[PDB]
Design a protein around this motif. Structure first.
Motif, short mmCIF file in Angstrom:
data_model
loop_
_atom_site.label_atom_id
_atom_site.label_comp_id
_atom_site.label_asym_id
_atom_site.label_seq_id
_atom_site.Cartn_x
_atom_site.Cartn_y
_atom_site.Cartn_z
N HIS A 9 -28.42 2.23 5.71
CA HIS A 9 -27.77 1.73 4.41
C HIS A 9 -27.10 0.61 4.19
O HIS A 9 -27.25 -0.29 3.61
N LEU A 10 -26.10 0.29 5.31
CA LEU A 10 -25.37 -0.78 5.77
C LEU A 10 -26.11 -2.06 5.86
O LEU A 10 -26.02 -3.15 5.43
N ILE A 13 -28.00 -2.71 2.63
CA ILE A 13 -26.95 -3.18 1.72
C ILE A 13 -26.54 -4.78 1.72
O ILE A 13 -25.97 -5.22 0.76
N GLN A 14 -26.66 -5.18 2.99
CA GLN A 14 -26.25 -6.48 3.28
C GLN A 14 -27.25 -7.46 2.96
O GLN A 14 -27.14 -8.62 3.68
N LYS A 15 -28.40 -7.02 2.57
CA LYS A 15 -29.59 -7.87 2.21
C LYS A 15 -30.17 -8.61 3.47
O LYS A 15 -30.32 -9.65 3.94
N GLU A 169 -19.00 -9.74 -23.20
CA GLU A 169 -19.26 -11.06 -22.37
C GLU A 169 -20.72 -11.10 -21.98
O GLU A 169 -21.11 -12.17 -21.21
N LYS A 229 -28.70 -33.49 -25.51
CA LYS A 229 -28.36 -34.31 -24.39
C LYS A 229 -27.61 -33.27 -23.11
O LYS A 229 -27.70 -33.70 -21.83
N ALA A 232 -30.89 -31.62 -21.47
CA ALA A 232 -32.01 -32.45 -21.44
C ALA A 232 -32.52 -32.61 -20.02
O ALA A 232 -33.91 -32.30 -19.77
#
Lengths: 388, 528
Positions: A9-10, A13-15, A169, A229, A232
């Protein structure tokens, strides 16, 4: 069966997806399967990559290992829904619900599935439930989408206002509520919410476009030109941006520098009726009358149930030595127009110039029944009146 | 000794701890006190499984340390027992481990324990209605997790692997006003069950996804918890899910959160040191060359920070002084968490994690186009001769519609369209130089759901230039949506290079008019 459950999992979890895969393979080789979390994380990794087939297979295996787990059934139905099959996704979410009747994810996903299945009563009720269990932004978005597809904005304004009420937000909610305000008569709260969005994200393209549109509508083309602008370079080839820029340059009498932008936008989208209508209008204003007919006829062939298109095509035919075609085009327009007196006034002008003066009064009375701001449609209103 | 997590035995005590996650959740290798050496003297732990996390406390002597075994709620640590309110897991007695080793604890890790020792297990069926532990640790699937002809019972779900632990201490003597129980589970919930009341009234999670840096994050002195998203966006979800702006303060994935003794240190994914305070503002500039993996900090005050080390992806020790960097090494790998458990005033942590499981103790303005004279002359011609242009373009369009309709009708007659109710689509690809070419017809049924049963392909070639083995063959049942490649071997016979066309006709078996057709210009032979 699951000696190193946490390390996996760790790493996931850290990709990492590289050491995690090696540890998964080692754990599975040691345990000969039945880990239920070297298969789960591996399937989630597969799903993170483009592949959603091996993810479905491994979620099937994880469901087979734990037959009475709701999360595994949820994941299998989700792997289905990532493919095109929504009915099977619904039928697996149902089983996932008859093991857990207290989670919002099942109801939200049933809503988004019934949405793709055009069952709007069940989708609507399921998403109401998904709100009542735990209110999330995506459920609000899907409910607004339901109320827009099915019916009117009268049902969507309440939902989007209640959504933006909390967690204000999110740019998507603000921008969509502002767009729906544009869709109605309100132009003030639309500007309020679009500015609220632009405070958070200054370079938001989807909001800059609508803000510039609103600005162009109430004159002041230079402010919208600066807004465009701003974005653009981010979108250098997008037909809507260049169409709005061409209308900006057409506002302040830069007709050539507007034909340029409009033709560039038309090249990048030859099936977009708005750019064709704009090209026809500008070539009418430029008094070319040979191109105007061409672009207006194209925009007619792309959206034929419009009234102004046939009016402008008839105005182009009046100067193209073809008055019978102008007659029939004006008839089409007056039949297909309901709330624009410019068509009636222009047909009255055509008739009076044809020496009739009889049906010109009919078109004048049709216009005066229809009715109010244009400076030059006011005078011709009174000049064709007094001279008739 | 093979950890997954670490601990700190004494929050203010001269000792240490560890955790064991070997095979099938056994957490009985918990190293122990005499923290001058922290040797093989390890306290007796009768825990059921692995404590997937650990923690500490203040009002008790770090008893509140939690054993978050997978599939079970954490447990306050009290030597040989637990202390759990109403969702934290039960005692040391392995509830899952015991069944495997409660009835069928016959022999060692071999099939002569269960599969070849069915004497002490066909008499004892004590762990009743085997759901949690149908298979013994020694036993494997095929005759130990597949010998459930006794019970084959099932059960229901539970919570998840609690991949965090953080607790607002100094109430562990009561153990109930330590209400913070930061359980960042692998079901994505950042669940906080009430401390000593076990209500978990608020179970809201700010993760919105999986948590890379779930713990060691929100230490505000007014208890504002910090959570890390899978996406890399860091949330600021405070006590009872307080609403705070979520900072996205990263470019890459922030999977490096680190406590700093006043703020919540996080590590930038793309080789950038991570510095930040509780109001979003990244206090620190980048200070790491590679990807770190586990920070920490040594001892100084609220206004203060001693040695704040870090890991690396290539595992180099990177001790960082408050004012300067210390080292960059080439050693074996690193951890998720360590602890400066110095008994005798060392700056260094002396905690080791390795692929091999080593337990270390080392202490070292725009682009609007322009228009020339040509454009104004052309517009003047258009303004003076627009009528003739309009008329002649309409005449040309009429003639073009005429000729296009003519050619479309001629194609329909000859049936030469490879795309033409009756849905199909075929195109023929040729591959290879040399006298032998591979000719593959890609055929496809293009319909919602309707197969096409009786179809057949017939080739038309010049029998003096090309030798087709099977110039006519049936096609399989075409399922809507699949491209069937049906290939043949064309062979050039002319000794001189001659390129001749080859026609392909797809047609029904009851009809004689081709359903559709295709053409291929065969390239030159390059023969011998």
């Amino acid at each position: 069966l699951e000696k190193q459950n946490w390390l996996i999992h760790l790493y996931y979890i850290q990709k990492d997806y590289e050491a995690c895969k090696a540890v998964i393979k080692e754990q599975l080789q040691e345990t000969h399967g039945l880990c239920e979390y070297a298969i789960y994380v591996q399937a989630l990794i597969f799903r993170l990559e483009g592949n959603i087939q091996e993810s479905l297979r491994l979620f099937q295996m994880c469901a087979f290992l734990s037959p009475q787990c709701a999360d595994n059934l949820k994941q299998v139905a989700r792997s289905l829904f990532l493919l095109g099959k929504h009915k099977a996704a619904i039928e697996v979410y149902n089983e996932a619900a008859k093991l857990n009747q207290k989670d919002w994810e099942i109801c939200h996903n049933l809503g988004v599935c019934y949405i793709y299945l055009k069952q709007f009563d069940k989708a609507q009720d399921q998403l109401h439930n998904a709100l009542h269990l735990n209110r999330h932004d995506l459920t609000y978005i899907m409910l607004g989408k339901i109320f827009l597809l099915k019916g009117d904005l009268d049902k969507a304004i309440e939902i989007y206002k209640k959504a933006v009420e909390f967690s204000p937000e999110n740019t998507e909610l603000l921008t969509t509520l502002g767009l729906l305000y544009l869709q109605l008569g309100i132009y003030q709260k639309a500007f309020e919410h679009l500015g609220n969005t632009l405070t958070y994200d200054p370079t938001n393209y989807k909001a800059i476009l609508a803000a510039g549109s609103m600005m162009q509508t109430h004159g002041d083309f230079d402010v919208a030109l600066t807004k465009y602008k701003v974005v653009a370079c981010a979108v250098i080839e997008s037909p809507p941006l260049w169409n709005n820029i061409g209308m900006c340059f057409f506002g302040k009498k830069k007709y050539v520098a507007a034909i340029s932008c409009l033709k560039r936008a038309n090249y990048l989208a030859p099936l977009d009726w708005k750019i064709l209508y704009n090209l026809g209008l500008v070539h009418l204003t430029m008094q070319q009358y040979a191109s105007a007919f061409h672009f207006l006829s194209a925009a007619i062939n792309f959206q034929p149930k419009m009234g102004e298109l046939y009016m402008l095509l008839a105005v182009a035919l009046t100067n193209l030595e073809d008055s019978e075609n102008a007659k029939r085009a004006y008839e089409e327009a007056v039949r297909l127009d309901k709330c624009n007196p410019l068509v009636n006034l222009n047909y009255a002008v055509l008739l009076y110039n044809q020496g009739e003066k009889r049906d010109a009064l009919a078109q004048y009375q049709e216009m005066e029944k229809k009715v109010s701001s244009s400076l030059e449609f006011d005078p011709e209103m009174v000049e064709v009146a007094q001279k008739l | 000794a093979c950890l997954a997590l670490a601990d700190f035995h004494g929050d203010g005590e001269y000792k240490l701890a560890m955790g064991d996650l070997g095979p099938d959740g056994r957490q009985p290798r918990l190293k122990v006190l005499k923290g001058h050496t922290l040797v093989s003297q390890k306290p007796l732990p009768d825990l059921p499984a692995a404590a997937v996390t650990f923690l500490m406390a203040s009002h008790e002597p770090r008893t509140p340390a939690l054993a978050i075994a997978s599939g079970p709620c954490v447990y306050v640590y009290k030597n040989l027992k637990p202390y759990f309110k109403f969702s934290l897991p039960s005692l040391p007695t392995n509830p899952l481990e015991q069944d495997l080793w409660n009835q069928a604890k016959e022999d060692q890790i071999d099939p002569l324990t269960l599969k070849e020792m069915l004497e002490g297990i066909r008499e004892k069926a004590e762990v009743p209605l085997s759901v949690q532990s149908l298979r013994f640790l020694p036993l494997e699937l095929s005759e130990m997790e597949a010998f459930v002809n006794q019970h084959k019972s099932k059960s229901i779900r539970r919570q998840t692997v609690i991949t965090t632990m953080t607790t607002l201490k100094k109430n562990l003597a009561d153990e109930d006003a330590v209400s913070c129980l930061v359980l960042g589970t692998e079901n994505k919930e950042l669940l906080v069950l009430d401390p000593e009341a076990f209500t978990i009234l608020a179970k809201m999670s700010l993760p919105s996804v999986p948590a890379f840096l779930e713990a060691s994050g929100q230490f505000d002195v007014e208890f504002r918890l910090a959570a890390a998203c899978r996406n890399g966006s860091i949330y600021i979800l405070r006590r009872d899910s307080k609403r705070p702006k979520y900072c996205i303060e990263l470019g890459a994935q922030p999977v490096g959160l680190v406590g700093v003794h006043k703020v919540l240190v996080v590590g930038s994914n793309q080789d950038s040191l991570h510095g930040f305070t509780y109001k979003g503002k990244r206090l620190w500039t980048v200070q790491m060359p590679a990807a770190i993996l586990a920070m920490n900090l040594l001892e100084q005050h609220s206004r203060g920070l001693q040695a704040v080390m870090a890991a690396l992806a290539n595992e180099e020790v990177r001790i960082y002084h408050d004012k300067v960097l210390l080292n960059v090494i080439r050693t074996p790998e690193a951890v998720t968490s360590l602890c400066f458990g110095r008994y005798g005033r060392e700056d260094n942590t002396l905690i080791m994690t390795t692929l091999g499981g080593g337990l270390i103790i080392k202490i070292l303005k725009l682009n609007v186009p322009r228009k020339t004279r040509l454009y104004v002359d052309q517009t003047l011609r258009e303004r003076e001769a627009g009528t003739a242009m309009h008329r002649t373009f309409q005449a040309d369009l009429y003639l073009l519609r005429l000729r296009a309709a003519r050619a479309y009708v001629q194609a329909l007659e000859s049936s030469l369209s490879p795309v033409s109710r009756e849905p199909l689509k075929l195109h023929a690809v040729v591959q290879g130089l040399g006298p032998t070419f591979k000719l593959t017809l890609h055929l496809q049924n293009t319909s919602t759901a309707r197969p096409i049963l009786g179809l057949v392909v017939c080739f038309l070639y010049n029998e003096v230039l090309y030798a087709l083995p099977r110039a006519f063959f049936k096609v399989p049942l075409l399922v809507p949506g699949l491209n069937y490649p049906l290939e043949t071997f064309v062979k050039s016979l002319s000794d001189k290079g001659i390129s001749d066309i080859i026609k392909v006709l797809v047609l029904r078996e009851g009809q004689s008019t081709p359903l559709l057709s295709a053409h291929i210009n065969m390239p030159m032979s390059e023969g011998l």
